[PDB]
Design a protein around this ligand. Structure first.
Ligand SMILES: [Zn+2]
Lengths: 347, 16
């Protein structure tokens, strides 16, 4: 029912999804989404590539069961200065101002997400999630999370994360939603076991296979960006180091120096760098899907580098945007060295 | 954060 229309303008027949928001949107509204940055909206075209079946099932289930009502709660007190956009509204400023108010400013939500320093409310909301996830209500879970529930939260008394619970219950859409808000399939409970483990123990094998795909999402995406293939996780090899183009020539001295510098980063900083490279990959990839889906009109009429994430420093953001300066060969070199060392660091 | 971010930024500059 809800799938027929854009969540942001009511425009018919939408082509993109905002995965973290569980909404389908049209092209125009997407073009504004892409400018907000992944920390606000994570965009993916619905028909251009195959999705993991259960990731798309999750987004479409969420949107058909009141996801948009969390984000538009205030509207549902109706005033003349706060009006939802209509399909024929100009992208600038009509649709844009609305979308930024919907998702960036969180203008229409029932209650804003608690401040990060709010330990007691964060804990309460998080214990609700860690219970709620056992059942199959995705709307409650998105609601809790929007309020500031933490998906990788560790229950001090029960000894487990929401992802453990969903996994032992076979709640795969829940697992999927939680992983979007960065739940970790590799986190051990107090008894030393991963959500992957609870899945297999429960006889939920596709979910187990899916959790492992989620574990390796970052490196899988980097490998695909250069090969058009991903590791075969059922085979047991979990990485895929693409070959460099200059493979017939000896490695140059600055290339060796660059990689030395990269290996020098602590695991924590390295994983931060890889998220950055992940984001740029996702940008360069979406750029091409954009040009492949858009009509000649819309294009010949966003941003040429990663959007600013306000929760990052000006330095972090500068490095992230510096990634757009990389030419194909430079970028491929960074991606290959990040892949071969993600592997090094895990053995 | 800044001491962490500055390490990342210098790795990135090494690849460009
Ligand atoms: Zn729209």
């Amino acid at each position: 029912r809800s799938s027929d229309v854009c969540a942001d303008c009511n425009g018919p027949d939408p082509s993109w999804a905002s995965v973290n928001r569980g909404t389908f949107i049209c092209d125009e509204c997407c073009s504004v989404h892409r400018s907000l940055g992944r920390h606000i909206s994570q965009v993916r075209h619905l028909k251009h590539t195959a999705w993991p079946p259960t990731l798309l099932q999750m987004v479409e289930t969420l949107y058909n069961n009141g996801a948009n009502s969390i984000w538009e709660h205030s509207l549902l007190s109706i005033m003349s200065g706060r009006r939802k956009a209509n399909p024929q509204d100009k992208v600038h400023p009509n649709k844009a101002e609305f979308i930024r108010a919907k998702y960036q400013m969180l203008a229409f939500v029932h209650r804003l997400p608690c401040r990060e320093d709010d330990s007691v409310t964060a804990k309460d909301l998080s214990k609700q999630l860690h219970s709620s996830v056992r059942t199959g209500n995705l709307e409650t879970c998105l609601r809790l999370l929007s309020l500031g529930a933490q998906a990788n939260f560790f229950h001090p008394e029960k000894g487990s994360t929401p992802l453990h619970v969903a996994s032992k219950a076979g709640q795969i859409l829940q697992a999927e939603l939680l992983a979007v808000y960065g739940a970790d399939p590799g986190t051990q409970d107090s008894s030393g076991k991963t959500p992957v483990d609870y899945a297999r123990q429960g006889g939920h094998h596709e979910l187990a296979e899916r959790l492992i795909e989620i574990q390796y999402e970052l490196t899988d995406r980097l490998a695909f960006y250069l090969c058009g293939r991903k590791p075969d996780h059922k085979s047991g090899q979990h990485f895929l180091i693409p070959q460099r183009a200059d493979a017939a020539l000896d490695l140059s001295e600055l290339a060796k120096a660059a990689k030395k510098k990269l290996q020098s980063l602590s695991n924590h900083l390295f994983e931060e760098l890889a998220m950055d490279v992940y984001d740029e990959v996702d940008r360069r990839e979406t750029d091409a899907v954009w040009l492949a889906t858009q009509n000649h009109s819309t294009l010949v009429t966003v941003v040429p580098f990663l959007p600013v994430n306000p929760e990052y420093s000006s330095t972090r953001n500068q490095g992230r945007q510096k990634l757009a300066r990389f030419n194909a060969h430079e970028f491929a070199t960074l991606v290959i060295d990040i892949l071969s060392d993600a592997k090094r660091r895990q053995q | 954060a800044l001491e962490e971010d500055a390490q990342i930024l210098k790795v990135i500059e090494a690849y460009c």
